[PDB]
Write a protein that binds this DNA or RNA. Structure first.
Ligand SMILES: Nc1ncnc2c1ncn2[C@@H]1O[C@@H]2COP(=O)(O)O[C@H]3[C@@H](O)[C@H](n4cnc5c(N)ncnc54)O[C@@H]3COP(=O)(O)O[C@H]2[C@H]1O
Ligand SMILES: Nc1ncnc2c1ncn2[C@@H]1O[C@@H]2COP(=O)(O)O[C@H]3[C@@H](O)[C@H](n4cnc5c(N)ncnc54)O[C@@H]3COP(=O)(O)O[C@H]2[C@H]1O
Ligand SMILES: [Mg+2]
Ligand SMILES: [Mg+2]
Ligand SMILES: [Mg+2]
Ligand SMILES: [Mg+2]
Ligand SMILES: [Mg+2]
Length: 90
RNA sequence: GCGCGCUUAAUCUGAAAUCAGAGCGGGGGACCCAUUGCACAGGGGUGAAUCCUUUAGGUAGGGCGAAAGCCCGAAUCCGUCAGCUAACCUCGUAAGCGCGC
């Protein structure tokens, strides 16, 4: 179900948070203004990221356009976040 | 208090003691392997002490014992955090009882 925030998984877990967040911003900022990027390397949350766009249209185009993209030698897997981000609800 | 036996990683050596060694342990922590995970109590550690039913029984598991059998099946701590893991870093060495003089 379409959301302001997109959920990406199947990401290379060896890549550190700063570099990962930097690369994600680099790649997704062209689709529109990005509100934020949440990345965690914990055991449960590693290999995943949440990209929160200012506009939902950006999220949709980004998902449709970047689906399966070779990123750090692994094809990105992109779906929509199950729940709205704190930033949008507020 | 002391003698030797018990659980335990809980012992031994410095006149006594975490203040220090040795011994014996716990945790953190790469390559490789494993993990596909919906974020903003949870997760995890030591330990045999985990689990289902109406305060209780049973139970995975565990202790003593030559085997019969008798028991235990607690407590607690890190604080949103930890897989395996070599190097390297860090900590613990409390306590409760059974026999006899
Ligand atoms: N690690 C463990 N895992 C699971 N259960 C455990 C356990 N450690 C102990 N238990 C159980 O709980 C009781 C605790 O006894 P405790 O050691 O306080 O007191 C014990 C012990 O201090 C002493 N004792 C037992 N066996 C001994 C022996 N062979 N020699 C000298 N003393 C002994 O007499 C008491 C008799 O205890 P008993 O064996 O009937 O009962 C024990 C035991 O059955
Ligand atoms: N991987 C992990 N994930 C999440 N939390 C973790 C963890 N590892 C340890 N912890 C937590 O932090 C404390 C670790 O203390 P420490 O580093 O001194 O590591 C140990 C050790 O110094 C000592 N210890 C415990 N069991 C031991 C054993 N069997 N042998 C030797 N030392 C032991 O006491 C501490 C453990 O008990 P404490 O009550 O201090 O509680 C633990 C526990 O609550
Ligand atoms: Mg262990
Ligand atoms: Mg049994
Ligand atoms: Mg024994
Ligand atoms: Mg570890
Ligand atoms: Mg790790």
């Amino acid at each position: 179900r379409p959301n302001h925030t997109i959920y990406i998984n199947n990401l290379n877990e060896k890549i550190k948070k700063d570099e990962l967040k930097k690369s994600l911003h680099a790649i997704f900022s062209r689709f529109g203004q990005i509100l934020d990027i949440l990345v965690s390397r914990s055991l449960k949350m590693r290999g995943q990221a949440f990209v929160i766009f200012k506009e939902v249209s950006s999220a949709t185009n980004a998902l449709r356009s970047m689906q399966g993209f070779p990123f750090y030698d692994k094809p990105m897997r992109i779906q929509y976040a199950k729940t709205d981000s704190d930033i949008i609800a507020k």
